[PDB]
Design a protein around this ligand. Structure first.
Ligand SMILES: [Zn+2]
Length: 140
């Protein structure tokens, strides 16, 4: 009981939900990466390496992935979303660091926030899908 154009919308909506779920999966892995960075930071401090004190920043270079993953989450929230020492390698050793100030809690907060936003988007799409099917049943 559906228009050709209603099929096209429902299909694109379901495909968008698919992309949003994959983005949430990516986000959960960013949370693991952040956890891995925190744990590697705690290990370097526990090892008693000269100069590697509790003031050590500890930001891992791979955490820049979190920055671009976050931007892709913002993209998918727009409706145009149709288109050296191994213990410290990669680790930022600045003390009282400010470019990475508070990275552990802030990056955790961003990524967890993106999961909630992406899940909200999925729910809006399920609501809209139910609305289209409601419109076609009313015309039926
Ligand atoms: Zn730093």
């Amino acid at each position: 009981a559906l228009t050709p154009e209603e099929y096209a919308e429902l299909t694109a909506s379901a495909e968008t939900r698919s992309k949003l779920s994959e983005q949430i999966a990516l986000c959960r892995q960013m949370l693991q990466l952040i956890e891995l960075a925190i744990a590697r930071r705690e290990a370097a401090i526990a090892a008693g390496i000269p100069g590697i004190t509790k003031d050590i920043c500890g930001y891992d270079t791979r955490l820049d992935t979190v920055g671009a993953a976050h931007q892709f989450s913002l993209f998918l929230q727009s409706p145009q979303g149709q288109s050296q020492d191994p213990r410290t390698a990669g680790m930022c050793l600045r003390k009282k660091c400010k470019p990475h100030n508070g990275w552990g809690a802030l990056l955790t907060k961003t990524v967890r926030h993106d999961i909630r936003e992406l899940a909200l988007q999925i729910r809006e799409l399920l609501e809209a899908e139910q609305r289209v099917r409601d419109g076609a049943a009313g015309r039926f």
